[PDB]
């Protein structure tokens, strides 16, 4: 038994799935996907915050960026919808008409994820649950069901891991003024006792009617409810040990962090479990704007996952689904393509630890990355190199054989000073796909 | 932009406007106006508290006294409106039939008043505009009708700054017990978690929808809610940096301190920013027994208001309107009759700021007040000596030039001795009203 | 970085040198040592707390112990030293004549043990390095030696691991009366401030001195301090990264938890890392009356070490020297027993990981345990079986091969039903010494 | 009185005094001054804080800088003292031989300064008084005089104002590890509740022995202390109420803000009183590194303190005395530069308030500020102009006379348009010394 206080439940480390899963998709989906509308500035991290909200990249704070008039989403939405149309109208747009679960979770595992996370609810307070606490939800408005239930029900038929988003820190639904700096989070909150019991009372029926696999908060806990946070911990943990929890909740205990887009990204190795976030384009909600010239490619989703993974932690990909419940296809081809290179060389990335180091590169700088599987050394060079001859420079390997991952072919290699020289055979070459893979055992 | 904490908030001092205004009218209108009943029994600060409560001479108490079985108003109650009605029910007879807000704006602007603060909601609970948190207001009840809002258009119509009172300290419709003695006061509070959160939505509402000159608070504030004052000060001053706020939350700040009747007024300059309130008769809400023996009368009103004025402070004078929406003659000729001093010594009131020392006393001790406009002194008596030789006891004036105010016209003093004499002719002392000012430019 | 708050020191977890150690030497050594006499009424969890502290088996109790008049040890202490012998006059006995830093480590490392860890203070108060902060230290009395120092540097020459042990709980020092049941714990105490800080300033002082691998604090963490362990820690771990601090500080962080004798033994796999500890006998401290019906045979503590590995954690056994330094030889004797049985199956302990169980049994009772490294499953009999056939209950593996550990023998098993049936050939089971270790690959 | 509470404290604001002397001079000297040496690396707020504490420009910083080893201090102090040469040691070579309070008073009156603040005790924590609480004070090593006292005295005498720096947040004597980035700062600090004791205790004591009109604190005030603010504000503040705090107590109240260097510049009007301190080169302790190229230079200080005053602050510059106690020849020249601008100019400096606006540029760039006196407007240019006709952008003036200052001459204006044009006559123009100064009155 797991108790109510910071102590004893720092017992709780990180479960051995999570730890090995390496792979999850996050699903940012609600009344905002509708108007799915933003424009398309940048990345977190890249745009100087003294004009991000006004200029807000990310399609799921439209509300808050309907609110600062003069704003591009302003002028947007007064054409499109009317001055008269209010943002939580949308809650009755949202009709999921060609939403299919099982498709869903198909595609996600198909894609390579191994957990799925969808927000159940995100800033804008309209919740994808049946909640008993707030009237703004899916059943009673929208869509009329139970979204994330019937979402869960399929990821888990899916035998996918199943956990949950939920906006502890902001609520709109609470507020009238819009975020304009970073500086306004420090005040513009709900503040209320009344929404501490809210969040609470709200997080505990996610734990009681779907026991999810993650409780994944966002943006802090309300400071008059860090304390329950306590109990909410023992009480999940106790029915569910093997569930898990994020560090977005200011509070002494977490059992992985999170870095996002720029934001909190490791150089190398940390000494803990961590996830990097991020969308397949610039926003996690959709956003119509956004084209290819926005998101990542197949190979570049590949080279992230692969520098996450070779660092300890989980790549969670978020995809931003369209009011109707369809994936837009630009979104769909990069999962199923990530997919593909997961299916040749899963087994290099699922379930691997790290090496010594995470990283390493050749003469001519094509970047290389390590994971490890016991004795099992695998060796991932972003992308595929012309020449045969290959030098990984400041390596030396002990192990005394070296493979091609993708065929088992041996291969003649040798520790070149202070340097480690390969020779791989262009038929071997030929054959791998957007990165080449070596397997060395010591 | 100002943060959510105490030395932050330290940055925001009283506003200019404040400052200079000098003259503001306080408005106590309720469901309490209806009996409009009350013993005039005296001045705070000079009725034994230990009656006090039973002989309530403050009408808007009416409620309180009423709990108080065998106090004169259940009495007067019992005997008018009968056992069996409710205070609650003066909620339907208050019907505001004869109101006019232009016009109270129109008397308040011919008064002299440069702000007006009329009681939201007093402590029987009962408020004036259509908040969303209770259906004890006047748009369901009553008048039918947002006083506080259609009294903001208008006051502002009218020139005048606006601002709100509001009772964050006491609200009957969360206690049953009345108030027998002061101590009463440390336990019979609403004390729950949901009161907190009430005033604070409440005083939100009230700068979302207004945007209030003034947050005028009374009796402190919820223990449970203080710190959410941190956030509604940075919240409020942000949207509204002119905003002001007085001293009654019981928390680190403050722009201005308050003083009742009696109670905390100065004696000489205090080193902030004060306001002196007071009825024009003992009560604040409406008392249909009080008539002009009991009223300051329009000398007093300037006395006061001079006294206050050269101690650094403004002068809010309370006017308690009917329930039908009309001002009482009594109280409305006193208002006309501090105006009409004000036109023709405005000059020396508004816009000024303390002199060296705010008293002095002639020879045969008319009681003399000062205030100053840069480099221009002005000497006010209080009242108009009779002699035409003045004898001002310990006091040099160094400036080269005395002047009578309301002529011009030059004047012959001399500093004789630790005193100062000066010629004022009959006909300059027959010229002023109520009070003889002199302007001394040193 | 790591940052002065629990939120931040979560991301230190147990360096992987400790968790892989899995055996260490803890040595309580003080003027306490001297007397080196106790009552051996039992083990702590089977003692009755009613009676404990009057018959108080644990030697380094001395002066709690002499603290009670009328206790054996009162008796004993006025029979053999006098009335008037006072217990600090102990510290000018403790000489450590034939003290030999480096014969300890020498002797800590044919035991096995990885790392040591000896008490710089005790609940006595008294400090074995010249500490600037107390005149009753091992460099001004007794000794006139730098204990700590002088032991830190031989055990690293050995090549092991140091860390310290320190009363911050208790310190008799501060407190007249002594503890004479469980409940006094609560009020007797140092309790004030100065002492807090003085706590502080010996943990900080050890740090800057010596830098433990461990630090091992006791009885909790004075409350007036408990604050200043964020500090600390960040300030230690950012000194020294693979540093560990274990649970007894009483604040949300710790990197390994502890159990003492019965007190707090898990009997499976609990979820985090921690250390068991006791002593060879049932004295921490020295206790001339300890005889080997009161200590572990060899035997035992091989199965004492084997079961504590195979649920997670480490065994701290602790070793009780006497006034001149020596290391008595019924101890000695048992270190060399453990160290032995270590040279031969120290692979199936050191740098092994828990099972999916730990734990099974022989269809005629043997106890079995299980470790793990990688494919490799060590399965260790505690004692070595009489038949060639080998029954174990509730057991089937999958692994294709199960060898004799200490030869490498295969052998053959099946799953016969819902167990294991394994044969050894008596040539190989009378190789083993006792423990009967099987290696099994899947 | 006051009371012992934030609430009550709010009551003090900034003294008149204080908000009307705009200049003051800093006076860092200690220990420190003797080895005088520091790398003039550059400007707080653009010197990358990754690398600013190992070429620490501040030279008081010496010892922090001594204890990181192989750092510009380290190699400088090891080949010119030696190793075996301690910071302490410098307490003794402290000798001010060659001071005379009474020339440093006289320089700051020539200067300008109408108030003065030596460091009574910098992070090394030596103290220049005789404190009863330290023996590491100028009355017992070193000087072997009382240099605050003594300096006191003097200031008074002159007819300046003094008052006192005092580290409260860092005190080396009380650690030992070095600060080697600002993420250090948050627990590297004595920590203690003796250390607040102390901290508490020397401010009370400068109070009652010198009773100064600043308290100018540093580096925060210890975190168990800040509760014994409320009593030492109002224990200072009832004996002396026009004393004043500066804020940098990390607590609800202070007097003035402040910016140093680059951090915490207003680029426009506050609405507080603030003060802005540097050095008159880079560091604030003697740096014998320093030439006029790390130097402000006459013209610089003034448009430094012109700049400074029409945003409301006061600027208070940092004069850095030799171990001997004179003050070096670069800054002797400087303020007796500045010194002599205020001859001319003082009279639209002391005792000003702020205008609508603070700044303003002309048609050709060159930066004009403004400074408030009831009427008068001050309009400073930061140099003269070469033309006669001068066009100041977006401004027009209501006044009907614009003169030069200095001369007195009525100058010829008017509003083209958006902008204001003066003539101003060569004969004058050549008149001004650094800045063209205007006088208009509206
Ligand atoms: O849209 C949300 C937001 O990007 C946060 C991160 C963030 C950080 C700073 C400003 C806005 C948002 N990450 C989770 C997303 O669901
Ligand atoms: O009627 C209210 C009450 O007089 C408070 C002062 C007060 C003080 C002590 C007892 C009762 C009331 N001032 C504001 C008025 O609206
Ligand atoms: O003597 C110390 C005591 O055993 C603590 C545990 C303890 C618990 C309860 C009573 C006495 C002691 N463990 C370490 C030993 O050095
Ligand atoms: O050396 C002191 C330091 O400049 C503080 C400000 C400061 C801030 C950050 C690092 C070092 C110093 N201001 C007063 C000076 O006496």
Same mark, same amino acid.
């Given at each position: 038994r797991y108790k109510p206080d910071w102590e004893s439940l720092r017992?709780?480390?990180? !479960?051995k799935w999570f730890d090995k899963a390496k792979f999850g998709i996050f699903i940012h989906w609600g009344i905002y996907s509708v108007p799915?509308? $933003?424009?398309?500035? &940048?990345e977190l991290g890249k745009?100087?915050? /003294?004009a991000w909200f006004f200029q807000? *990249?990310? $399609? %799921?704070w439209y509300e808050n960026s309907l609110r600062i008039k003069e704003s591009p989403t302003w002028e947007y939405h007064v054409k499109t919808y #009317?001055?008269?149309? %209010?943002?939580?109208?949308?809650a009755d747009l949202f009709? $999921?008409?060609?939403?299919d679960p099982q498709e869903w979770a198909d595609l996600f595992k198909k894609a390579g994820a191994k957990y799925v996370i969808p927000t159940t609810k995100h800033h804008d307070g309209f919740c994808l649950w049946g909640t008993?606490?707030? /009237?703004?939800?899916s059943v009673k408005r929208? *869509?009329?069901? /139970?979204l994330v239930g019937d979402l869960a029900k399929a990821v888990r038929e899916a035998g996918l891991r199943f956990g949950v988003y939920y906006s502890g820190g902001l @609520?709109?639904?609470?507020?009238?003024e819009p975020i304009?700096? !970073? %500086?306004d989070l420090s005040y513009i909150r709900p503040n209320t006792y009344e929404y501490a019991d809210y969040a609470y009372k709200q997080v505990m029926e996610l734990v009681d009617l779907y026991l999810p696999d993650v409780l994944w908060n966002d943006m802090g806990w309300p400071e008059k409810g860090k304390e329950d946070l306590k109990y909410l911990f023992a009480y999940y943990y106790n029915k569910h040990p093997e569930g898990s929890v994020n /560090?977005?909740?200011?509070? *002494?205990?977490? @059992?992985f962090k999170t870095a996002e887009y720029h934001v909190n990204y490791p150089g190398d190795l940390p000494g803990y479990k961590w996830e990097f976030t991020r969308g397949? #384009?610039?926003?996690?909600?959709?956003?119509?704007?956004? &084209?290819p010239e926005h998101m990542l490619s197949v190979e570049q989703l590949v080279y992230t996952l692969v520098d996450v993974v070779s660092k300890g932690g989980n790549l969670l990909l978020n995809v931003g689904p369209k009011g109707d419940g369809t994936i837009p296809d630009l979104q769909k081809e990069r999962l199923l393509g990530l997919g593909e290179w997961l299916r040749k060389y899963g087994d290099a990335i699922y379930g691997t630890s790290v090496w010594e180091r995470c990283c390493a590169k050749t003469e001519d700088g094509t970047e290389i990355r390590f994971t490890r599987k016991c004795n099992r050394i695998f060796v991932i060079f972003l992308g595929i190199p012309t020449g045969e001859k290959i030098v990984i420079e400041d390596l030396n390997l002990s192990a005394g054989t070296v493979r091609?991952?993708?065929?088992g072919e041996r291969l003649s290699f040798k520790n070149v000073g202070k340097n480690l020289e390969i020779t791989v055979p262009k038929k071997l070459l030929e054959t791998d796909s957007i990165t080449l893979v070596l397997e060395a055992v010591e």
């Amino acid at each position: 038994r797991y108790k109510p206080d910071w102590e004893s439940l720092r017992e709780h480390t990180v !479960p051995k799935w999570f730890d090995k899963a390496k792979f999850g998709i996050f699903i940012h989906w609600g009344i905002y996907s509708v108007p799915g509308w $933003a424009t398309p500035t &940048g990345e977190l991290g890249k745009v100087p915050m /003294d004009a991000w909200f006004f200029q807000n *990249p990310y $399609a %799921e704070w439209y509300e808050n960026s309907l609110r600062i008039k003069e704003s591009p989403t302003w002028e947007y939405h007064v054409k499109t919808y #009317g001055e008269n149309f %209010e943002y939580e109208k949308f809650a009755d747009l949202f009709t $999921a008409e060609k939403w299919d679960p099982q498709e869903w979770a198909d595609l996600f595992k198909k894609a390579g994820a191994k957990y799925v996370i969808p927000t159940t609810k995100h800033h804008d307070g309209f919740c994808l649950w049946g909640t008993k606490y707030t /009237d703004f939800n899916s059943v009673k408005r929208g *869509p009329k069901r /139970d979204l994330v239930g019937d979402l869960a029900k399929a990821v888990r038929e899916a035998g996918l891991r199943f956990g949950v988003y939920y906006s502890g820190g902001l @609520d709109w639904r609470f507020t009238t003024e819009p975020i304009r700096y !970073p %500086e306004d989070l420090s005040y513009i909150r709900p503040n209320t006792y009344e929404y501490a019991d809210y969040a609470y009372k709200q997080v505990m029926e996610l734990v009681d009617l779907y026991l999810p696999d993650v409780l994944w908060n966002d943006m802090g806990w309300p400071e008059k409810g860090k304390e329950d946070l306590k109990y909410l911990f023992a009480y999940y943990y106790n029915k569910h040990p093997e569930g898990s929890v994020n /560090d977005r909740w200011g509070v *002494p205990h977490w @059992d992985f962090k999170t870095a996002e887009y720029h934001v909190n990204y490791p150089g190398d190795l940390p000494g803990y479990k961590w996830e990097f976030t991020r969308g397949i #384009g610039l926003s996690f909600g959709y956003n119509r704007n956004e &084209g290819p010239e926005h998101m990542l490619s197949v190979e570049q989703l590949v080279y992230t996952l692969v520098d996450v993974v070779s660092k300890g932690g989980n790549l969670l990909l978020n995809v931003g689904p369209k009011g109707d419940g369809t994936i837009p296809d630009l979104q769909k081809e990069r999962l199923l393509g990530l997919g593909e290179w997961l299916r040749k060389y899963g087994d290099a990335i699922y379930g691997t630890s790290v090496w010594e180091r995470c990283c390493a590169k050749t003469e001519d700088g094509t970047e290389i990355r390590f994971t490890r599987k016991c004795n099992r050394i695998f060796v991932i060079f972003l992308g595929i190199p012309t020449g045969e001859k290959i030098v990984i420079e400041d390596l030396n390997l002990s192990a005394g054989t070296v493979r091609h991952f993708l065929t088992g072919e041996r291969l003649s290699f040798k520790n070149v000073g202070k340097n480690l020289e390969i020779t791989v055979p262009k038929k071997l070459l030929e054959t791998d796909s957007i990165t080449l893979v070596l397997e060395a055992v010591e």
